[PDB]
Amino acid sequence: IAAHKGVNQAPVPLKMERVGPHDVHIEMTAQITDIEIDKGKIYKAWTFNGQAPGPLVVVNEGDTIHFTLKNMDPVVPHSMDFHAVHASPSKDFIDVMPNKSGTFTYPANKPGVFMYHCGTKPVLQHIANGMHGVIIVKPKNGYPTDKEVDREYVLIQNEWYKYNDMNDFQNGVPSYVVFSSKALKPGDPNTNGDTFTLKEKPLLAKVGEKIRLYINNVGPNEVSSFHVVGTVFDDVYLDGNPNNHLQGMQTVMLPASGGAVVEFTVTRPGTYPIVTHQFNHAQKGAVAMLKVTET
Amino acid sequence: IAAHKGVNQAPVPLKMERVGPHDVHIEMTAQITDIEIDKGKIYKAWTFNGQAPGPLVVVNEGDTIHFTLKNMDPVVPHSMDFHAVHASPSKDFIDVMPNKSGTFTYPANKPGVFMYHCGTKPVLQHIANGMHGVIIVKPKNGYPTDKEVDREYVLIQNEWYKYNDMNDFQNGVPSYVVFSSKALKPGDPNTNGDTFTLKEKPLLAKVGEKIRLYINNVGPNEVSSFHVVGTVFDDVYLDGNPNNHLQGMQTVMLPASGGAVVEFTVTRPGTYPIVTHQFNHAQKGAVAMLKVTET
């Protein structure tokens, strides 16, 4: 796209604020930003806020979201679809034109780990170019295992294809498949979907801890066979809904857009890989590391 | 196939009749019928009754099916495999020769949303050419959420490949991936697997209704990441068995041949897309629409 030649819009922080006991404002941008998805490989991503996947959103069950999208793309319209919400797609997930803003309001009444993404036709194009992310909705009554958890992180799986190539997007294998982590608390890492950052700077934990991961596979196209090497998942909640409780899974099948809360114990010091067990995808990037130490 | 050149057998209605409290007769044809799977693209499908997917069958839990297949194909043998039934495959799902009939009898003792398909070697060939469908077996004690449901529809996902090309069938990506709807009650739509009909003539519903969909992904080859835009599934029963109950799923993973009953609320007027969230497949056709109005 001629109007994207040379464009590299600096990342803008997510803006969020509570405005009532059950109402939150969120303000994001749609923007065009160069991301290093593999060593030496820059993708001029279509993004929310200059991150791909986008910034993490966390709300409470029962919160109504008042969402603003500021479209900084000079020529392409963009939109937002939160899977967490009940909305009219043809009124509430509609396009915001270049250089304009739009505000939409809708309730998040279901707990879980939900995908969000741009909803602009062709959706495949907007997702594959980078406009995806996760919104967590915290359950009003928690999870039955909350008292057991020592540490938590968010991981997101996505694919990258040949740049803005709709033939490849529809008909080709992924060039890269990657994990990213999004911060839940100060000091947590916050990364983009790339083949290396979570290998080089592993997530951290202590020996004997029970770890919770909030996970979502945003696709666009692949399913995920989520596995942590050297452990077994003690508890799994499908889509992060507390009622969808499985125990003792070695690997969690995630559809495209599929989420879960998973919990596991790291019993020994060492480095623990985190993979999709579809090993072709792992080989093309989708391995993160968790470094477990005595401190 | 030389004997299929020029053949376009008119669709024949499904014949069904109850013959006892726990016995039903079903009579289908195997026939060769031109179907428009994409605008301008005719596929000379191998079908049951000149529909692809085939006609919907609905029986009650505990019904014995007395099934007749009349084979109208001039040269290819065909057969029937109902996933709902307990049968001897090598006695009961056997071939009926061109211009002959065969009758087979077997019980449907398990509730759910089951695939049926031709079982003639090579099965991939017969399925991919169009000989697939769904049989619903209604649970004797219903579903715990039955009283909540306002409206219901059936949707089926399938793929189409290069015409009768076994190399493509085994080794290629789908050319199209599509939804169809099959009628449960008078006035419901009844369509074939195509890229456009359920976009142009959406399914209908009223604001505030809880909708049930009976869904099956017949493949032949792909898995499905079933999602309704603008809502969350309140209840999901895997394979339509009432015991396999999940809550608050954003997306349901269906294997090839996999079924579910899913229920969700449409809270606002508008058009709600229904997709497989494997967006490559969506882009190649698998988007249906549900139009929700104040009346």
Place this chain on the structure above:
Amino acid sequence: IAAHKGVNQAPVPLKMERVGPHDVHIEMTAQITDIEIDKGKIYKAWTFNGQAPGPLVVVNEGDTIHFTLKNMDPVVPHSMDFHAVHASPSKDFIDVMPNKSGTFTYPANKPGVFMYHCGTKPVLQHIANGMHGVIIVKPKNGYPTDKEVDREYVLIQNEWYKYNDMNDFQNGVPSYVVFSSKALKPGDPNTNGDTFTLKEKPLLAKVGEKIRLYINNVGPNEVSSFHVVGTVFDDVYLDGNPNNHLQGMQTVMLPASGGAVVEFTVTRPGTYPIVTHQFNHAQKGAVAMLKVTET
């Protein structure tokens, strides 16, 4: 690999012995062995013990495994990752050099049907070349349906690609997808992953029996839509954990590395195919047979 030219190491039996109430020794080899994966097609597989998938391991919940790997490969290092165990991957699943042994110790505290495989970088390469298998961990309190089961078998699904071709492994479709069976009791078959053996020598059962299958899809890359023709699964335990109980599934979705215990009734004499319902994979080999007789 020049040092593998002409090498065909005879299969070595698995060595296992109990050494305490909650401790077992297991001794395996890594070795290079010619396997006939399709009629006329030899693959010079990287194996455990000259079988691909590897020998079946069965332990009890709560057993600590003292595992020895003797590496008979003249030039490639190998390792072992059991999904059943809690271990430090970077201390316990490490490489054993050619012509050396290594001993590692770790607990199996979770019941189920777990994948094991070589963990040597690039893992995709080691898995795809044949270094995969299953370890069953028997639950201390059994399965609620144990008293109903008449007969049991183990089946494993895997893929084969172009020989030792990492481009194909990462980016290509499988050449073959196959089932194998591993012996649980004397007299059971014990086979390798090939396109024909379980068609030509079906598994055996008697009319009216409830059959249990312990199943795992080791990949490396594909998911599995596991189905037995002519029946419905009465009970399914995901990953073989007794808590993950589904009922009346026609087809079980398995991730790559995914396992299950499944149970079904064969009501009539005949031959019952067992497939992945991803029919492209079935066509490329993944059909086994169960022959059900009056005796």
